[PDB]
């Protein structure tokens with residue numbers, strides 16, 4: 001439900017962070033059209049007086065000197081009186097945007113970064129778990145940035161999240177294991193972080209620096225800061241950080257195969273600036289983890305299919321040895337249930353239902369048997385909470401919280417149905433998820449919740465979720481019984 | 483093993499390359515036990531005068547100054563009158579081995595390597611092929627190293643190889659597409675390159691520097707140089723390099739899930755030395771490429787399986803519909819042959835064989851059947867050159883160069899046999915593959931071939947290979963035939 005939270009235009013807030021300067025230029029004279037109000041502390045003159053002036057009248061030589069590789073490459077290091085700065089160039093709203101922030105100061109940064117890239121490639125990671133892969137990614141991002149807490153955050157299908165892994169200094173509270181509402185990161189934020197994979201919040205208590213003028217005159221709204229490294233973030237999120245007791249924040253999008261899988265989120269208790277070059281070095285790490293997860297995930301999935309296929313094949317064999325449907329199905333009980341990781345299975349071969357392992361009563365199966373016919377599924381149907389869809393069996397969570405059903409005939413209702421019991425799960429939410437925000441009276445002013453202490457909830461009446469291999473295995477069993 | 487080529491103990495040749503110095507110390511007094519004969523060029527005095535001295539009294543002060551971190555990290559930079567050097571430690575034959583080698587002179591090396599690691603780890607790699615991956619891998623190694631010609635070299639199953647990709651500077655001889663005898667890299671070299679994944683030959687024309695004494699006194703043979711970065715290589719190979727017109731060579735092992743998959747092989751026309759840290763940066767790229775390849779390959783196999791499972795799912799639906807068996811093995815003719823990418827199929831389900839598509843005559847199929855029933859196979863059998871093993875069909879490469887057979891019953895002869903035609907292939911070898919070496923009369927001194935000019939051969943009478951997904955699909959078909 002697109003509430004207040006999803007409707008704040010976080011690319012049109014018109015402010016930048018105080019540690020950098022932003023200038024925007026228009027046209028072939030490159031006339032200054034927008035400038036951050038703090039620009040005097042790097043240009044020498046009041047920002048108000050530079051609007052409408054050509055880039056050659058406005059920038060210092062050291063910068064202009066490096067315009068071509070800047071335009072070609074996006075960023076260059078320039079040494080100005082105030083010190084070493086990184087200059088970043090992009091295009092937005094038909095303007096050339098130039099940002100300046102302090103440059104990396106450690107000469108051996110790239111050398112350290114190459115070493116941790118090795119830890120994260122290595123012969124084989126994931127060796128004792130994809131778990132171990134996440135922990136190393138957290139550990140190495142924490143090594144390269146120096147943040148007090150680094151966490152790997154995975155989105156669930158409903159866009160709520162949980163901290164799978166976490167590397168942090170001794171003496172820091174943690175969030176390992178906890179789940180967070182989907183509204184902690186609303187729709188338009190997720191969309192932006194799909195496009196802009198990096199964001200640094202250098203000081204969560206600093207006031208944002210405004211742009212001048214406050215609109216782009218051509219457009220009647222603020223400059224689009226979607227791709228600004230200096231963009232100041234939603235004030236609601238600043239409040240969220242300060243309620244966590246967080247003084248600086250850095251997060252990196254984990255894009256797996258083009259989709260937003262999760263984040264690596266970093267917290268620091270005191271303000272902290274990370275250089276652009278160091279941020280891009282961390283981003284190489286996150287692209288690395290994303291690749292290691294894909295290769296391991298696909299290996300896991302091929303090994304699972306292998307196991308299922310061996311079962312179908314041993315089944316196949318058994319049938320070729322004595323015309324004995326019920327006979328062999330009863331003899332190969334483990335295999336038929338193992339096919340899909342099930343605890344029971346009804347085989348509707350026409351006459352009576354044949355019930356193997358742990359199932360609902362004969363009456364009750366016929367009841368969902370009849371109900372299954374009038375359903376809009378083609379050849380297979382599956383659910384991990386039968387009760388939420390067919391309450392005649394809502395009380396049988398003990399044997400049928402989940403079913404996987406394949407249709408063995410066109411017209412007619414001949415099926416094999418696998419059953420799963422519920423599996424109770426205790427999840428710990430970081431604060432009470434029924435009160436994920438605090439709106440003011442009148443529900444125009446929204447605020448973050450004030451507490452992130454564990455709030456425990458137990459999930460009932462849902463099975464283990466049917467995996468792609470379960471489905472494939474069911475399709476193959478259907479091919480063999482036709 | 484076979485040739486004299488496999489016999490040469492290449493880790494026991496007792497020589498190092500002239501750009502570095504090797505020292506080996508024994509026991510608690512760190513007494514110098516083995517030293518390269520050029521050691522004076524770095525330590526002022528006659529090496530022979532140094533055997534038996536404690537490390538503290540042989541090594542220059544500058545190296546000693548760094549002793550603690552060297553043994554710790556195993557590598558360190560030291561500034562000596564002669565220039566900056568990388569000091570490397572490892573253990574061999576119970577000695578501590580110290581190697582000295584000119585250090586990297588460009589301070590921006592690591593920044594550069596991080597840039598090329600981006601190009602290769604980036605989102606959307608291979609997104610115009612694994613071919614594009616290899617091309618990118620060669621291009622990035624060539625840029626990082628400066629070598630004239632960089633090639634990606636893949637081992638076939640018989641351990642001969644072919645250049646799959648190549649990045650070289652304008653107007654340079656190439657080898658793209660050519661095949662090289664397995665003996666070009668004999669067995670003990672392949673073994674050594676699986677555990678020591680980097681090798682540099684700085685000057686293909688230089689004489690090796692001997693070690694003193696020529697044996698380890700305790701062992702009566704020379705110091706094991708398996709792990710030496712300075713190891714001078716087999717003389718037959720140096721002769722092979724010079725016959726190629728190559729003055730410097732550097733290659734890296736490509737390990738993919740533990741096995742030796744290929745090499746990245748670089749040639750320079752003149753001598754050239756890459757620093758150790760620059761070679762370790764290149765090693766990061768090859769580990770990257772191997773990761774990229776596993777993920778792309780396991781994705782390709784998943785997509786293949788899904789296409790086959792879709793075919794089986796459509797066959798399953800044509801069954802349980804109208805008619806007999808031969809009455810759906812008839813429109814699904816197309817599907818039945820597509821299961822395994824085949825041009826024909828014979829079905830022995832009881833009566834006479836049922837022949838679908840491009841098959842050999844019924845009498846020939848009957849005789850093949852009779853023959854297959856006596857071979858030693860459980861469920862499936864396959865070959866891509868039927869003729870070598872069953873010469874009654876050696877003449878029929880037009881329809882039956884390859885076969886794939888599943889048993890549809892136990893002690894019975896019920897089969898499904900899929901057929902492929904031959905696919906002619908034009909291999910171009912780098913020189914005459916019938917003369918891969920030139921021995922001297924008496925067969926005690928071998929030399930490499932003199933020529934690498936293209937040498938054509940056409941492989942006849944072999945089908946396209948039966949891949950994993952064909953085999954899985956066949957097993958799937960057998961499960962539906964019961």
Ligand SMILES: *C/C=C1/C(=C/C2=NC(=C\c3[nH]c(/C=C4\NC(=O)C(C=C)=C4C)c(C)c3CCC(=O)O)/C(CCC(=O)O)=C2C)NC(=O)[C@H]1C
Nearest residue numbers: 005010180183184189233234237249250251265437447448
């Ligand atoms: C009413 C709307 C709400 C809201 C808005 C909001 N949050 C934003 C950014 C953001 N949230 C998170 C959440 C987390 N940070 C953590 O460490 C954890 C758990 C470990 C979670 C769940 C993150 C990581 C970010 C990114 C910024 C950062 O610190 O890394 C934004 C976008 C901010 C922007 O302008 O870019 C918005 C609009 N948060 C709420 O809780 C409610 C009230």
Ligand SMILES: *C/C=C1/C(=C/C2=NC(=C\c3[nH]c(/C=C4\NC(=O)C(C=C)=C4C)c(C)c3CCC(=O)O)/C(CCC(=O)O)=C2C)NC(=O)[C@H]1C
Nearest residue numbers: 487492662666671715716719731732733747919928929930
């Ligand atoms: C009778 C033995 C023979 C022999 C021995 C041999 N070769 C060795 C190393 C080596 N060979 C190759 C081959 C290639 N180089 C290329 O560029 C291509 C293709 C374009 C090929 C096929 C390589 C790459 C290497 C590794 C060293 C390198 O140059 O990168 C060795 C081991 C050398 C060592 O001591 O490490 C041996 C013993 N080669 C023959 O041709 C026959 C005569």
